[PDB]
């Protein structure tokens, strides 16, 4: 299983509910996101997903990217423009924390919609702490010395 940190934006209106996973397989991030599937379904015993992986955004990013994504944190670079055919994103530092926005599409579908995501406060804490981490482990080294 792989390292990751998530956010559960849940609301009574699934229409706007969401969850935003952030994981790192080796040297590449995967900014992912599932729109709240099903109502605010109550019951811990429910082992079912409460998020629509069918309407999931999954942007695997380059290795150098992790760098940039990080270097932005260190205020070395004001912002970061990642453009592609499957997506267009910009990672800039918000006043409350970090903010990723641009244009991306979900699985089997071609709708380059308008997207925005806010990593703020204690959450901007964890992203930073994560990226700073992910890129440190990316090189392997530890994986190796075992």
């Amino acid at each position: 299983s792989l390292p990751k940190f998530e956010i559960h934006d849940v609301r009574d209106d699934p229409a706007e509910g969401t969850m935003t996973r952030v994981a790192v397989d080796g040297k590449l991030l995967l900014i992912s996101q599932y729109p709240q599937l099903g109502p605010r379904k109550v019951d811990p015993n429910d082992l079912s997903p409460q998020f629509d992986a069918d309407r999931r955004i999954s942007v695997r990013l380059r290795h150098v990217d992790l760098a940039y994504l990080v270097g932005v944190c260190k205020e070395r670079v004001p912002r970061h423009r990642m453009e592609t055919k499957a997506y267009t994103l910009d990672f800039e530092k918000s006043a409350q924390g970090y903010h990723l926005h641009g244009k991306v599409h979900r699985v089997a579908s071609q709708r380059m919609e308008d997207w925005s995501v806010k990593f703020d406060n204690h959450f901007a804490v964890t992203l930073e702490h994560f990226l700073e981490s992910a890129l440190d482990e990316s090189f392997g080294f530890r994986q190796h010395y075992a």
Binding site: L2, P3, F5, N121, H122, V125, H129
Partner: protein
């Protein structure tokens, strides 16, 4: 004597101790062992019982706040310069980790821990080193917990 001092050592919760022994008023002295133990972030508090010198045991526990893996980023937040404070409500203890306007990069941990209804208090400060200490300790706590140790 140094060899067994490893497989044994390994079997200890990761920690570090903030030590504030007062050589004048045994009371005024306290020790705080901050540590890790399966997700949980425990903080044990002690008051100097025996004297700084005295051939006896110098540390004596009292209460024990046990922060849930959540706050780890929440403390780290005041520690870093975002959060302007952070509070915690155990089943008995009540606290707030706020910075100290005295000296920069230093923090204070205020408390009041009621027990079935016992109004008890303790304010453990963290100076530069200690502030840096916690900070690292915690980061490692999050780094390792979220994974990366695999």
């Amino acid at each position: 004597s140094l060899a067994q001092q490893r497989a044994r050592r390994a079997q200890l919760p990761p920690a570090f101790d903030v030590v504030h022994w007062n050589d004048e008023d045994i009371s005024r002295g306290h020790l705080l062992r901050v540590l890790h133990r399966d997700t949980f972030v425990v903080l044990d508090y002690h008051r100097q019982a025996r004297m700084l010198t005295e051939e006896g045991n110098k540390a004596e526990r009292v209460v024990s706040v046990m922060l849930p893996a959540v706050y780890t980023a929440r403390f780290l937040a005041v520690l870093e310069g975002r959060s302007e404070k952070v509070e915690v409500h155990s089943r008995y203890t009540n606290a707030t980790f706020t910075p100290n306007p005295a000296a920069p990069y230093t923090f204070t941990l205020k408390c009041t821990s009621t027990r079935p209804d016992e109004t008890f208090e303790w304010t453990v400060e963290f100076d530069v080193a200690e502030s840096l200490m916690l900070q690292r300790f915690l980061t490692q706590a999050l780094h390792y917990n979220t994974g990366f140790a695999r």
